[PDB]
Each structure stands twice: as C-alpha cells, then as structure tokens.
C-alpha cells in the first residue's frame, strides 16, 4: 500500500511548485508569450518543433507475433482509423508541439462510430467499429484548477473554465520533464528565463542609450534678451532662422556658416556661440559583447548551438547514427515520451473500450528525423559481410534499400540482362 | 482559396476547359487576399469552426476553401505567421539603421 | 511546409473532387512532392557499387530506375538497348 504520498504543492488546486511568483500558470503563460518574443528563445523552441514534426508515424505489432494475421489486420485498421480522423496526425502533432511553450498539453479523446457514416461524425470505412475524432486539441491557459486525489497520488483530472470539468481518463497529459509528477511539468523556458531577463534588459538600455547619443547636435549660444516676445521684430527673426537652421541644417554639399560675433571687452568671451555638443567620457560596459554572451547562454540553455554555430563536422541529425547531436537525443527523449504517453494512454482505451480485450497491444514507432551517413553504412556492411559475420537476409536488404529511400524489392519484376554491360 | 469546380467535362462555356469527359473540373480561384477576410463565422461552441466571410461582401460557407495553416497550435485560423518571431529583432535593427543614416546627414 | 499542404489535402479539394463525382471509395489518391535537389550522386554511386558485390542489395527495376533519374533520364526502354558492336 502507498504508505506515503507524492504530494508536490497542493496549494489550492493550483500547484505551486515554482517558488517564483510570475512563473505560475496565472502568469506564467504571460511570461512564456513574452519570453516567446525573443529571438534566440522563439529559435531554440522551433527547432524542438521542426524535428518533432518532421518525422512520421506508423503503427507496428510487437517484437514477436509479427507475422500473426490478426496482429497485421489490427495494424491495419490502427492506421486507416488514424488517417479517418478529422484532423489529421500531424495537426494533433502540431497541436501538442505547443509541449515545449508550457511542458503540458492537455487533449480530450473524442470517439467516434462509423455507423455507416450518417452520424455527427462521418468516417469511410463501413465496419461499425469505435475510433476517434476532433480533439484532442485543448488550450493550456484554460484549465483553471487540478482536482486532486485524497492522497494526492495519481490525479490527472483539471477542469477547462454546468461545469465543464473532465475526468482523469478522457485527456491525454504530455509532461517535458516530470520528475515529482506534477501535470504542468517543466518547460524548458523554466531554466533560461534568468539569461531571457538579463538580455532583454540590456538591449533595451542599448536602445535608449542610443536614441538619446546626442553628441554632435547643433547648440546655439544666444543672449537671453534675444529669446522673448517683446524682443525687437530684429531679435524675433533672427531667432526664427536659428529654428529654421537647427532643424534644417544638414551635411550637404553647401554646408556653411555666417554667424555673428563679439568678444565682449569684460570676461573676454563670445556671446554668440554655436558649437557642436560634446561628451568627455565613454560608456563603461560594452553592452555588445554582454548581450552576445547571454544568447550564447540561452542557447546552451536549448542546446541549441548548431544555430548558430553552424552544422559541425562532428555532428548530425540522425538518431541512428553515433554522432547524433546533443539537441537530437533531447528530440529522441521527447519523441519517446510522446511514444509511452499515447501506448499508455489512448491505444490501451481503443483496444479496451472497442472490446476484443486481447493481452498484447499493438504500439506506434517513428522513423529517424535525417537518414544516417550512408557512406559509413556501406563501408561497414562491405567491411563485415564479406568476411562473414553479419549474415544477409531480407532485413538487410529491406533496410538499406530504405535507407535510400525506396521499399522492399518485388521479385516479380527483377531488372533485364540484356540492358546491361 | 474558395474553389470554384468546372462541370461537365466538354467546351460549352461558363469556365470552358479541354476533354468532354462530362466529368467535374476546378478552375479559376483559389485567388483570394488576406486584407479582404473580415470576420471568421463561428459554430456554437467555438469547436471546429472554419468559416468566414470576405468583406459588397461574399461570405463563404467552410467547406468552400482551403485554408492553409503555418505552425497552426491552439487551431486558431490566422495559425502564426514566421514574421511573428521576428519582430523584436527587426524594430530595433530598423530603427538603429535610421538613426545612422541621420547621423551621417 | 511542404508536407502541411500535403495534409490540407486531406479533407479539401480531392476529397470534394472526389465525393461530389460519388464514387465513394474508401481508398483516396493522395499528392505527393518530389525533393528540392538531386542527391549527391557521388555517395549513392560509391554506396551502390561497393555494396552489391557483396550482397545486401537486391537488384531492382526501381533501383535501376532512380539511380538513372538521379542523372536526369527516365526509365530505360528494353527494345532498344545499347549496341555493342561500337562498345571496344
């Protein structure tokens, strides 16, 4: 028995993990949409984004039972239902990838029954079976409160503000990083906000302190009595042209200057002085080099470095291959969230729900985002075939002939001798 | 991009098109332009709604166009334009830029 | 971006096309692209050829077919090959 409990904050329904008040869902999203603004953040969390959405999905029996006529048959119906929904895979993709701005997502399942179509939802394949459609989908900043479970251990349930509370088992929860099984997760902005704040601050003094670099303006020197308005019609126009040539004045080619002057015999100085204003000092920190510090930070933060360092010699994208980047293995652990999220969740309810109620369920299995060094494939193939070892069969020859992007060869139509040497 | 479908495969007229296999065809808009879509037509609860007028005004009914969504995330219509992430970077470039240029004048 | 209009393909005009024409097949004809450029040659041909000497691959009309659409050629003709008498 769970002599104990896991409870995280219980605070009022709301978990009040984060001890920083403006990173908490009444504010947190606030925060999140403003962090988002930012270039290297908004950059960092597309390219998660991007590699999640690029590759797809295609559902598979399990390690054995392979060739099991009913496990292909099921196999089969998974995927037609899964392109009968209406909204297709990669939108619920997209829809869940707002993962990444929050480290939650919520998605009711909505079932569905072809029922020969002519229902609330039309399908296309007539076999009266249960499936799925609409949302998922959901918005994150409208769950208002978590209803917890006596005990505080495993309770899924929140409202979306009768009511229109929702129970535990109807949504599906895909957490980034949850570690003290908290719904909200952590979002990766959590553990950059710091360098976001500092970055954003002193770009903003560098703007003003550029909009207020007056150095070099013109400044006209005259006697107080000229500035007025019972000053002679005289004094009046002459400070007229000086507001004319102050805001006039420019660098062209003709570019000149009569001015009045007089050296008055007491304190020996010009009373009329027109002189560019000038500063006798440099600014202290080199704001530059501090706002290119903190980027690279917030991208370390993502590990999200081959932005903008470039694509290294040293990496790549594919999961496959052993020098996949450190960006990508982040990737590879979300994507196997998503893939233990959706076995747990909505497959176990499809195959339950819809009855048949077998032991063994079929799972779903991704691709790799960039195909592998196919040059290094081939040299180790050549280089341990050829002295034996690795043994050729049809799995061989399946996978490398996708690896160039074709499908298993039909023997049926073998290539001619006579078009050839 | 409201579709607009061709009839009866076969010269004729309205908007004429080659064969004469009596079939349906697709001609002329797609077309379309962002600053005409004035208002986007609701369905009760707000859930699945794609449809919107064009404002004189033509509204459409939903299964009248195709809509094509950039990084579509809480299945909002307008989706999020890549310029959105781009904003912060471009006011201050442009601006900095503009007061180089008056500097130098 | 590509694949996204490729879904938007989904529900609208091939569907409309095809359910107003009736019909009413549960399997649909779906649109597809082709890539930005050709692949490195150079890798597919050292791939290739010092991979089917040893095994693995299985000869194939489709592999004899993108291999010489990598070039920039289409399908060979087997009425008329290559002669020989030239070729020393």
């Given at each position: 028995?769970?002599?104990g ?8 329904g ?197 909009s207020?670099?007056?150095v ?46 007089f ?5 020996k ?28 930070q917030?991208?370390?933060?993502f ?11 040293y ?77 050729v ?29």
């Amino acid at each position: 028995g769970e002599v104990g409990s896991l409870g995280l904050k219980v605070r009022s329904g709301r978990i009040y993990e984060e001890p920083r008040q403006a990173l908490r869902f009444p504010e947190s999203i606030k925060t999140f949409q403003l962090m988002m603004r930012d270039p290297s953040v908004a950059a960092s969390v597309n390219i998660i984004k991007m590699f999640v959405r690029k590759v797809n999905w295609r559902f598979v029996p399990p390690k054995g039972k392979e060739k099991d006529a009913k496990m292909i048959e099921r196999a089969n119906f998974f995927n037609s239902l899964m392109n009968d929904m209406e909204h297709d895979w990669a939108d619920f993709i997209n829809s869940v990838m707002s993962f990444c701005t929050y480290g939650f997502c919520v998605n009711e399942k909505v079932y569905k029954k072809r029922q020969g179509k002519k229902g609330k939802y039309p399908s296309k394949y007539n076999d009266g079976l249960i499936g799925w459609a609409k949302l998922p989908i959901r918005n994150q900043t409208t769950l208002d409160k978590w209803y917890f479970d006596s005990d505080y251990r495993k309770v899924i349930g929140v409202r979306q503000n009768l009511t229109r509370k929702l129970p535990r088992s109807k949504f599906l929860l895909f957490k980034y990083d949850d570690e003290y099984g908290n719904p909200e997760g952590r979002s990766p902005l959590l553990n950059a906000y710091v360098p976001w704040k500092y970055k954003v601050q002193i770009e903003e003094f560098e703007a003003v302190g550029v909009s207020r670099d007056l150095v070099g303006m013109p400044k006209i020197g005259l006697p107080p009595d000229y500035l007025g308005e019972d000053a002679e019609p005289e004094k009046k126009a002459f400070v007229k042209y000086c507001q004319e040539v102050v805001n006039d004045l420019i660098a062209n080619d003709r570019a000149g200057l009569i001015w009045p002057r007089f050296i008055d015999p007491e304190t020996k100085e010009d009373i009329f002085e027109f002189s560019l204003v000038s500063r006798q000092g440099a600014k202290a920190y080199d704001t530059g080099s501090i706002i290119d510090r903190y980027s690279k930070q917030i991208m370390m933060a993502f590990m999200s470095d081959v932005l903008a360092m470039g694509q290294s010699k040293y990496g790549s994208f594919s999961l496959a291959d052993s020098k996949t980047s450190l960006l990508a293995m982040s990737v590879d652990i979300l994507l196997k969230q998503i893939k233990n999220v959706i076995n747990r969740d909505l497959v176990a309810q499809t195959y339950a729900l819809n009855m048949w109620d077998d032991e063994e369920h079929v799972e779903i299995v991704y691709d790799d985002i960039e195909t592998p060094d196919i040059e290094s494939i081939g040299s180790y193939v050549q280089k341990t075939v050829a002295v034996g070892a690795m043994e050729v069969d049809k799995a061989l020859s399946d996978k490398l002939r996708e690896h160039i992007g074709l499908e298993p060869a039909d023997e049926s139509k073998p290539v001619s001798e006579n078009l050839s040497p």
